[PDB]
């Protein structure tokens, strides 16, 4: 998955998330065209496949011809009552896309972090099953402690949690941020 955010001079905007699913998709590359094919079929559930200990498959997301599989993606645009864009945000990475997008919003809209901080701030994730809270390695350790005393099991992400690209309206114009976890930078004028 890859996320990108765009705001044009006239204030119109695009939030776009695109994906071939897992890293290098199906691992099938065309020797002639060079196209790398997705493995999006993996995003369906199958009665024959168990992905987590004790997790049954979800009938609503079973394969049928012509059906689209469920996705974690959620490219989002927030606009103010006056019709002007406030935030353009989305994420890539895994099941953690949705939670990371929520965090970016919470961080900017509520905690008051500027867009770069909102993107760079440590994240955490919980998706009910597995029954564990994953936190990034530089999270405030008082938070880890607050979670464990409330009986959460926490574990440290081996790498990083999701990838967020964002744009927010400021008094000085459009502030943009790309996530250092993947190595992006924005551009504008």
């Amino acid at each position: 998955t890859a996320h990108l955010s765009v705001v044009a001079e006239d204030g119109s905007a695009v939030s776009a998330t695109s994906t071939i699913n897992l890293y290098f998709g199906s691992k099938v590359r065309s020797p002639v065209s060079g196209i790398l094919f997705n493995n999006e079929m993996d995003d369906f559930s199958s009665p024959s496949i168990t992905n987590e200990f004790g997790v049954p498959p979800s009938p609503a997301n079973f394969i049928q011809p012509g059906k689209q599989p469920l996705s974690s993606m959620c490219p989002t645009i927030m606009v103010g009552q006056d019709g002007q864009v406030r935030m353009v945000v989305g994420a890539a990475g895994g099941t953690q896309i949705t939670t990371a997008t929520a965090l970016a919003i919470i961080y900017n809209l509520w905690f008051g972090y500027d867009v770069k901080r909102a993107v760079e701030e440590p994240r955490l994730h919980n998706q009910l099953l597995p029954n564990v809270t994953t936190v990034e390695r530089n999270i405030d350790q008082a938070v880890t402690a607050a979670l464990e005393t409330r009986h959460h099991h926490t574990q440290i992400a081996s790498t990083f949690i999701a990838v967020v690209q964002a744009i927010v309206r400021t008094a000085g114009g459009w502030a943009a941020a790309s996530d250092s976890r993947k190595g992006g930078e924005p551009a504008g004028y």
Partner: protein
């Protein structure tokens, strides 16, 4: 500290070169959609592990003149010969041609460009054609993805063809060139999207997928259609509206998370001390858990009835009912959140 603030316009992509390519499209008179497409084409090169014309996408688009938001659905779709029991293991659903769904990417670009384009179609491709031929140093993300999958990459010579130097995966800084995809991008630039779905690329696409054991046919490609959604999902957040795609994407989950949390009225104070901060983050995790409990009822709404589920997931009242079950001093076992696999 690394801020980037622009007076007129901005592109935030996951590679600097693609942000610049998007930015230049804007500067040359492109719409936000032109810029997005130009940038997406580039990301498919520089972060080829993560997206590209062999995949699918969703765009959320806001027009500041009409003040209307729309969504373009161009996610891949199960081929016509697919069926519920076609896979018996995870490896089967993940590797090889049978794991491939019908790519929607190019068709998504087409519909978006049809409705909102200003620059010519070919102009959107030119910078990436060049880039794929000239080559570029492998970035941080792609390098880590290469390392992560080095075994598979090194054992499959059609991938090693481009992703290796001397039998070993490319490392950060080393040059990656994609000469076949450059030619393919050029064909797309000149012949249009039709070349992919019903034209000169089509037979070869089918051949490559079936050769790898897949079942996508020409008819699947001929029949693929991106879809316009005129009324995407929204929620109110204070004086703002938030536009996001519904099922089959995760807007409904995001909406529920935020609607749960909004009743706590978070502000800067919520993170000013360790005691407040700890409770705030606990509350976030519990909102995640409730929202994920409901996620398992979601699926493609063309095939499953999710009307009522999504209505609940976006209702502030339903959210308030869940927030009232969040315990400030403890989390709970799985069943407390009432995960649901049937309505």
């Amino acid at each position: 500290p690394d801020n980037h603030v622009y007076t007129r316009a901005a592109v935030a992509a996951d590679a600097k070169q693609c942000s610049k390519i998007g930015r230049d499209a804007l500067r040359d008179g492109g719409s936000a959609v032109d810029a997005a497409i130009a940038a997406l084409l580039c990301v498919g090169l520089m972060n080829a592990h993560s997206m590209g014309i062999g995949g699918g996408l969703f765009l959320t688009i806001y027009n500041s003149t009409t003040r209307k938001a729309e969504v373009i659905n161009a996610r891949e779709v199960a081929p016509r010969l697919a069926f519920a029991t076609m896979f018996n293991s995870s490896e089967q659903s993940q590797k090889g041609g049978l794991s491939v769904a019908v790519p929607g990417e190019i068709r998504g670009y087409e519909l978006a460009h049809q409705r909102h384009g200003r620059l010519p179609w070919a102009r959107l491709f030119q910078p990436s054609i060049q880039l794929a031929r000239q080559g570029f140093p492998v970035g941080k993300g792609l390098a880590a993805a290469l390392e992560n999958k080095r075994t598979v990459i090194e054992q499959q010579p059609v991938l090693c063809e481009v992703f290796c130097r001397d039998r070993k995966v490319l490392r950060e800084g080393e040059r990656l060139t994609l000469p076949q995809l450059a030619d393919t991008y050029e064909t797309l630039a000149i012949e249009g999207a039709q070349a992919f779905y019903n034209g000169s690329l089509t037979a070869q696409i089918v051949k490559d997928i079936q050769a790898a054991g897949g079942i996508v046919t020409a008819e699947d490609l001929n029949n693929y259609r991106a879809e316009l959604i005129e009324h995407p999902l929204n929620i109110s957040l204070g004086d703002v509206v938030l536009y996001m795609p519904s099922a089959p994407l995760s807007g409904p989950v995001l909406a529920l998370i935020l609607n749960i949390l909004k009743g706590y009225n978070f502000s800067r104070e919520s993170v000013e001390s360790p005691e407040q901060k700890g409770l705030t983050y606990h509350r976030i995790v519990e909102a995640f858990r409730f929202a994920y409990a409901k996620r398992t009822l979601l699926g493609d709404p063309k095939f499953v009835d999710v009307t009522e589920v999504v209505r609940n997931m976006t209702s502030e009242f339903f959210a308030a009912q869940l927030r009232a079950q969040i315990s400030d001093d403890t989390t709970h076992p799985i069943s407390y959140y009432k995960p649901e696999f049937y309505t």
